[PDB]
RNA sequence: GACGGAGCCAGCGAGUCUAACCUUGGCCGAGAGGUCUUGGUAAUCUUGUGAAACUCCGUCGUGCUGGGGAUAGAGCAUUGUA
């Protein structure tokens, strides 16, 4: 737990303003942007796949690929 | 789960059961920083206290944490079935305590301490800097003392 | 197939050959075919109707 | 007429013998031929545990 | 075309049938649910804490459709696993016999399973019925 | 009987071993060359193939009597 | 002062009702090891020991320590019947004269006789 | 990669008579274990040894950590005269 296993309001808004141009988003991506850890990185992946922005083309946890909605 | 939007309700490090507990990680293993409440025990406390398991320690408004406090020093009072404990049929009052952070080692102490009231070979094997569970001291365990 | 580990190590094995021939037969020639053709080594088991 | 001559000899390594040579040590107990392993190596043709392969 | 639960993949059926018996409410979740280990070859209690019993009921039901019979000890041999022996490598142990036996009694109470002759549990006619029916449901939700 | 066939054949081998070693120790000065065991109905024939079997036959019923008796009384044979 | 202090408790049972209760109620509330010990072996285990034990407890020199009652039953659980008596315990030699204490209940006599002079690395 | 579900797969094998081996099944128990039968002297039943490594679905998120299971305690039981 380096940081951000909680959501700290401005982080998800900075995600919505910083996932354009992300060709590559996943669990490890939402960790490695100096951001949300793998517990609720899955939550923000589920909540951006909830509407619009990221589109999935693979399958399971430990291995994902989600994209910009183009 | 889901994005929630929570506020200064998210509060970092707090003291429950006489020790300080880190925030923003899962309550089940936040409580395993506390002595006497193991991973199984803290998991079952977070289940039986009607607590969402998936939350952090940063969550958990005070009622659920106070009920967790109330559970951990009252095990069979809130139905922990006494196989799930560590000090069954105690040694003096004969009850079933789940002893806690500043108690469990103390009661652990008491077990070892009463050996010096009895003179059994257990305490005799304890005193010399050895292993009381009978395994060999000839070859293994060489970083010892 | 049976194996025998033995002690610089060592191993043997084994051979149980077991068959059944069913002769639904009169008792006369059963008694004849069991008294005749005796032989060293072979075990004959003469059991009766399939129950 | 003697009352003190026996420990329980029903189990343990002393509970049996090699039928050739009294041995507790090396005794084969698979299929109950009850031979010590060195005499097993010797009498394995007399009993018929042959080296086949 | 016709369906069977052999005709359906197992995992998505078992999720749908766990949710289906959740809908049903015919449970027999004796009372020691989630204070229990559910398999002696494991350490921690299950993660969902409201259920794991419908999951196991679904697994036992489909596994009994696909087989002649299994017993209490056969489900212990199935849902047991390799528990770590710590300083020593792994080894397989029969699971908790109570939990699997109570799943058998639960599915017997609903008429999803029946105590088999030769020993064990056969799938019941209502068991075959309900399994193949919501297996058709599990396919037609993915059609 | 009630003997597993594995144990049956191993026990038969043990019996032939006791035959071979015992009749080796016994009839060595008759030039013992071998036993063979042939069970028929009503008989179980241990044949002493040897060089000097007239010293085995005995005086008009002797030591072959006594040898069958030794085998009889040890092995509980009728 | 009026309070004669208190007695210790074995597992929730004080000494005054420990000594004058039984062997078998004690091994009831004694743990699974002692309960498994006295569940089997019902064929009078402290046989000569109890008779000589009570004989020296009655031959005790007027509220002094009783005479030594020597045995090889290292595996004998101290039961509240023998509290206040004197037991001689073997270890290879060395019959250790041991007072049975009120608190000593539930454990083996062989735990009270050390079977070796310990290690002495060097120590000339 | 831990953790739990969830899929659930081998071959080499060993098995009790003038006794107490493999154990199915069915209950009871988180369990340990216990109970009661049942089959197998074994291509017959244990056993199709439904083995794990493996596959899916996430709880974890890079943290002597949920990795690792050293220490240690108390209880329950089984092996055995102990």
């Amino acid at each position: 737990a380096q940081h951000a296993v909680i959501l700290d309001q401005e982080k998800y808004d900075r995600i919505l303003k910083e996932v354009p141009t992300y060709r590559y988003v996943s669990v490890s991506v939402l960790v490695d942007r100096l951001k949300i850890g793998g517990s609720l990185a899955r939550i923000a992946l589920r909540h951006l796949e909830k509407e619009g922005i990221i589109k999935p083309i693979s399958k399971h946890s430990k291995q994902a690929i989600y994209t910009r909605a183009t | 789960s889901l994005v929630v939007q929570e506020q200064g309700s998210f509060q970092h490090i707090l003291r429950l059961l006489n020790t300080n507990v880190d925030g923003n990680i899962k309550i089940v293993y936040a409580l395993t920083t506390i002595k006497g409440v193991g991973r199984r025990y803290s998991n079952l406390v977070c289940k039986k206290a009607d607590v969402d398991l998936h939350k952090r320690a940063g969550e958990l408004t005070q009622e659920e944490l106070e009920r967790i406090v109330q559970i951990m020093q009252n095990p069979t009072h809130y139905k922990i079935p006494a196989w799930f404990l560590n000090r069954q049929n105690d040694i003096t009052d004969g009850k079933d305590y789940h002893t806690l952070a500043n108690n469990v080692e103390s009661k652990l102490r008491d077990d070892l301490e009463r050996l010096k009231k009895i003179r059994a070979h257990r305490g005799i094997r304890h005193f010399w800097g050895l292993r009381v569970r009978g395994q060999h001291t000839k070859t293994t365990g060489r970083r010892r003392a | 197939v049976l194996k025998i580990s033995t002690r610089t190590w060592e191993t043997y094995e084994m051979r149980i050959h077991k068959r059944y021939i069913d002769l639904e037969a009169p008792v006369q020639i059963v008694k004849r075919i069991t008294q005749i053709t005796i032989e060293p080594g072979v075990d004959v088991e003469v059991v009766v109707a399939s129950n | 007429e003697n009352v003190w001559f026996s420990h329980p000899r029903r189990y343990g390594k002393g509970s049996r013998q090699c039928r050739v040579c009294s041995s507790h040590t090396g005794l084969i107990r698979k299929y109950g031929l009850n031979i010590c392993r060195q005499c097993f190596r010797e009498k394995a043709n007399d009993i018929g545990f042959n080296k086949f392969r | 075309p016709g369906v069977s639960v052999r005709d359906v993949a197992a995992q998505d059926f078992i999720n749908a049938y766990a949710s289906f018996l959740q809908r049903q409410g015919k449970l027999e979740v004796p009372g020691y649910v989630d204070i229990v280990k559910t398999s002696s070859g494991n350490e921690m209690p299950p993660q969902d804490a409201e259920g794991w019993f419908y999951k196991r009921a679904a697994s036992v039901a489909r596994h009994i459709y696909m087989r002649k019979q299994v017993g209490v000890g056969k489900l212990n041999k199935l849902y047991g696993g390799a528990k770590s022996r710590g300083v020593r490598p792994y080894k397989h142990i029969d699971a908790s016999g109570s939990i699997n036996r109570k799943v058998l009694q639960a599915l017997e109470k609903i008429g999803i399973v029946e105590i088999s002759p030769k020993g064990g549990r056969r799938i019941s006619e209502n068991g075959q019925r309900d399994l193949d029916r919501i297996a058709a449901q599990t396919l037609e939700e993915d059609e | 009987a009630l003997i597993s066939k594995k144990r049956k054949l191993v026990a038969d081998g043990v019996f032939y071993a006791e035959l071979n070693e015992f009749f080796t120790r016994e009839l060595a000065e008759e030039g013992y060359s071998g036993v063979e065991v042939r069970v028929t109905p009503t008989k179980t024939e241990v044949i002493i193939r040897a060089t000097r079997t007239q010293d085995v036959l005995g005086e008009n019923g002797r030591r072959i009597n006594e040898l069958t008796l030794l085998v009889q009384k040890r092995f509980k044979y009728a | 002062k009026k309070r004669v202090f208190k007695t210790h408790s074995y597992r929730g049972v004080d000494l005054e009702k420990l000594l004058e209760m039984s062997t078998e109620d004690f091994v009831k509330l004694a743990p699974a090891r002692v309960r498994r010990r006295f569940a089997r072996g019902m064929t009078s285990k402290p046989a000569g020991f109890m008779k000589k034990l009570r004989a020296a407890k009655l031959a005790a020199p007027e509220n002094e320590k009783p005479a030594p009652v020597r045995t090889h039953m290292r595996n004998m659980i101290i039961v509240p019947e023998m509290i206040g008596s004197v037991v001689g315990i073997y270890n290879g030699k060395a019959f250790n004269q041991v007072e049975i204490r009120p608190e000593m209940l539930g454990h083996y006599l062989g735990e009270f006789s050390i079977t070796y002079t310990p290690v002495r690395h060097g120590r000339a």
Side-chain angles (χ1 to χ4, degrees), chain A, chain B, chain C, chain D, chain E, chain F, chain G residues 4-124:
Chain A
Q2 292 300 111
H3 198 270
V5 206
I6 203 60
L7 38 90
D8 291 328
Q9 185 68 40
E10 293 179 353
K11 289 171 183 167
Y12 184 70
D13 290 329
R14 188 174 292 169
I15 288 167
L16 267 72
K17 294 182 184 295
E18 284 180 354
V19 191
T21 67
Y22 278 174
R23 186 66 176 172
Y24 187 62
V25 286
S26 69
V27 176
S28 298
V29 178
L30 289 181
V31 177
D32 288 331
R33 295 294 186 183
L34 205 280
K35 286 291 184 183
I36 52 173
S39 293
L40 56 84
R42 288 178 173 89
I43 271 89
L45 292 175
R46 183 177 290 174
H47 203 275
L48 292 175
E49 187 180 357
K50 182 257 185 180
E51 194 271 333
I53 299 169
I54 63 174
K55 297 187 293 187
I57 58 168
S58 67
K59 189 170 68 65
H60 62 278
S61 295
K62 87 182 282 295
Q63 280 310 128
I65 171 65
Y66 301 163
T67 59
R68 174 194 275 178
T70 62
Chain B
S1 67
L2 79 159
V3 170
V4 303
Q5 306 296 323
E6 79 174 8
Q7 58 184 358
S9 66
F10 173 74
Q11 55 92 33
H12 59 278
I13 180 167
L14 77 161
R15 183 178 179 179
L16 66 157
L17 262 303
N18 297 318
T19 59
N20 287 319
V21 173
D22 193 1
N24 69 16
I25 49 98
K26 183 174 176 180
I27 180 168
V28 173
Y29 293 144
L31 293 169
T32 61
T33 63
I34 302 170
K35 310 294 186 290
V37 283
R39 296 188 289 115
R40 294 296 308 273
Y41 194 81
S42 170
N43 206 164
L44 189 53
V45 168
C46 294
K47 287 186 178 185
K48 295 294 293 296
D50 193 74
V51 171
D52 185 74
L53 281 301
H54 299 88
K55 292 183 182 180
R56 303 291 93 192
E59 275 87 0
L60 274 290
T61 62
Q62 297 294 319
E63 287 183 352
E64 297 180 354
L65 286 174
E66 282 177 352
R67 286 193 295 273
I68 280 166
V69 166
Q70 195 65 255
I71 287 174
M72 289 186 292
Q73 63 258 13
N74 293 116
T76 189
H77 297 281
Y78 288 161
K79 191 65 179 176
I80 297 172
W83 64 271
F84 207 76
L85 270 64
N86 55 4
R87 197 171 174 86
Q88 308 181 6
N89 195 357
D90 188 356
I91 208 66
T92 53
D93 50 357
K95 290 176 70 175
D96 294 332
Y97 290 165
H98 184 82
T99 54
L100 297 186
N102 291 320
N103 199 6
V104 61
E105 191 271 333
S106 298
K107 296 300 289 182
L108 180 63
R109 175 257 187 187
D110 287 329
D111 281 329
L112 300 175
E113 284 296 325
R114 79 181 293 273
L115 264 297
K116 289 183 181 182
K117 195 179 258 77
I118 270 89
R119 297 278 82 79
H121 188 273
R122 179 161 62 189
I124 297 169
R125 186 71 174 173
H126 280 293
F127 183 75
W128 296 345
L130 293 170
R131 296 280 79 79
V132 76
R133 287 185 178 179
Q135 72 269 18
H136 298 172
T137 62
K138 181 173 70 178
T139 63
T140 61
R142 289 181 177 178
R143 195 188 176 188
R144 188 83 272 275
Chain C
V1 180
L2 311 181
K3 298 182 293 181
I4 307 298
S5 180
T6 301
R7 182 67 184 270
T8 62
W9 290 96
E10 186 181 2
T11 180
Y12 294 160
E13 65 182 2
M14 181 179 287
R15 278 80 175 272
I16 299 170
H17 300 289
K18 193 177 184 291
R19 280 88 175 94
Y20 65 89
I21 301 169
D22 305 336
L23 301 182
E24 289 180 353
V27 70
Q28 176 64 256
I29 205 74
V30 166
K31 286 178 181 180
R32 184 181 180 273
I33 205 167
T34 55
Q35 66 89 29
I36 203 65
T37 66
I38 46 94
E39 181 69 28
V42 177
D43 191 2
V44 180
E45 292 180 353
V46 183
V47 78
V48 74
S50 297
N51 193 2
Chain D
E1 70 272 15
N2 293 319
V3 188
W4 50 97
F5 182 74
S6 293
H7 183 71
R9 294 176 184 268
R10 297 186 299 272
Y11 60 84
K13 264 70 72 175
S15 67
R16 76 272 178 184
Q17 73 171 357
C18 179
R19 68 184 72 251
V20 178
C21 59
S22 299
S23 176
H24 310 290
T25 332
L27 185 139
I28 305 290
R29 204 183 71 188
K30 177 181 268 183
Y31 301 119
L33 69 153
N34 290 318
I35 308 296
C36 63
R37 65 170 184 86
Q38 306 89 13
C39 289
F40 175 74
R41 181 180 59 194
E42 294 165 352
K43 286 94 168 66
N45 206 164
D46 287 330
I47 300 166
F49 286 99
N50 303 115
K51 182 72 174 177
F52 289 104
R53 178 177 61 85
Chain E
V3 83
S4 176
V5 81
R6 290 185 179 88
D7 291 332
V8 185
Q11 295 183 355
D12 53 354
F13 172 74
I14 287 162
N15 293 318
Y17 196 86
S19 179
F20 179 72
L21 260 291
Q22 186 67 257
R23 294 177 184 96
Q24 289 296 109
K26 296 177 98 292
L27 33 86
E28 193 175 359
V29 287
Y32 55 95
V33 63
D34 83 9
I35 76 172
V36 66
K37 191 182 287 186
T38 68
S39 177
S40 70
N42 289 319
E43 182 179 1
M44 296 308 297
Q47 57 189 356
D48 190 78
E50 186 176 3
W52 70 252
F53 198 90
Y54 304 100
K55 293 286 292 183
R56 186 181 290 268
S59 170
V60 168
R62 183 198 50 80
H63 191 276
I64 284 173
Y65 191 89
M66 292 180 178
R67 273 76 173 181
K68 296 179 183 295
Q69 69 267 15
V70 300
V72 174
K74 296 293 179 68
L75 293 179
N76 298 326
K77 193 171 184 178
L78 181 62
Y79 300 105
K83 184 175 175 65
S84 179
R85 297 184 68 243
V87 71
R88 292 182 292 272
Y90 300 158
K91 186 170 74 174
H92 184 76
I93 301 298
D94 287 331
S96 66
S98 181
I99 296 300
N100 295 318
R101 189 177 66 249
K102 295 298 184 293
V103 170
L104 291 171
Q105 294 175 1
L107 301 174
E108 181 179 359
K109 186 184 290 184
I110 310 162
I112 296 171
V113 87
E114 58 188 2
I115 296 172
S116 176
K118 301 175 184 178
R121 273 89 178 92
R122 286 181 292 111
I123 188 74
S124 66
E125 64 273 16
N126 193 5
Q128 296 188 359
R129 196 265 183 278
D130 188 71
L131 263 66
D132 294 333
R133 177 176 59 83
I134 83 104
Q137 178 184 1
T138 308
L139 290 180
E140 294 295 326
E141 63 92 18
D142 289 332
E143 62 92 21
Chain F
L2 201 267
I3 306 295
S4 179
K5 189 62 67 174
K6 300 180 176 67
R7 188 174 64 243
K8 181 71 177 295
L9 294 175
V10 174
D12 291 331
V14 168
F15 170 69
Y16 186 74
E18 191 169 1
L19 289 177
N20 197 0
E21 176 173 355
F22 165 65
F23 287 104
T24 295
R25 295 175 186 270
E26 178 69 28
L27 293 174
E29 291 183 354
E30 283 81 3
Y32 171 77
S33 179
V35 292
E36 65 176 358
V37 49
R38 295 188 178 181
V39 57
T40 62
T42 315
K43 296 183 292 295
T44 303
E45 296 177 352
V46 177
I47 293 95
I48 311 297
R49 298 182 70 252
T51 67
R52 198 173 293 112
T53 60
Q54 189 66 41
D55 288 332
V56 178
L57 182 63
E59 301 170 352
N60 63 13
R62 281 195 71 249
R63 186 62 180 268
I64 198 71
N65 204 169
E66 288 174 350
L67 290 178
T68 52
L69 283 167
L70 296 176
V71 177
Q72 167 180 354
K73 297 300 180 182
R74 181 258 165 279
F75 289 102
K76 298 174 286 293
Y77 287 163
Chain G
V4 285
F5 175 74
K6 280 306 178 186
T7 57
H8 188 73
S9 60
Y10 177 70
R11 286 182 187 268
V13 171
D14 279 334
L15 266 305
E16 294 178 353
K17 61 173 73 174
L18 277 167
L19 277 82
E20 300 167 351
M21 181 173 66
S22 75
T23 295
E24 62 185 3
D25 293 331
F26 174 72
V27 310
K28 284 182 182 180
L29 84 149
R33 179 68 265 168
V34 182
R35 184 171 60 246
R36 175 59 178 264
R37 174 62 187 272
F38 280 87
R40 291 174 65 188
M42 292 181 182
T43 174
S44 296
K45 54 182 78 172
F49 180 76
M50 281 295 177
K51 291 187 263 79
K52 295 179 178 63
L53 197 280
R54 189 174 294 114
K57 183 67 180 293
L58 190 147
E62 285 89 8
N63 198 358
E64 293 179 356
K65 288 184 179 181
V69 180
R70 295 175 179 178
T71 184
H72 279 182
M73 288 182 67
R74 291 178 56 88
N75 55 4
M76 184 185 294
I77 298 295
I78 292 176
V79 80
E81 187 177 1
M82 65 183 71
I83 288 177
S85 296
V86 170
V87 182
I89 307 169
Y90 189 72
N91 64 14
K93 55 174 65 173
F95 281 148
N96 288 318
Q97 177 171 2
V98 175
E99 177 184 0
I100 298 300
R101 282 197 294 273
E103 289 85 3
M104 282 182 175
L105 293 174
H107 292 285
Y108 295 89
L109 286 180
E111 301 181 358
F112 300 101
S113 182
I114 183 65
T115 64
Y116 52 89
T117 56
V119 47
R120 297 181 183 90
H121 290 298
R123 276 78 179 268

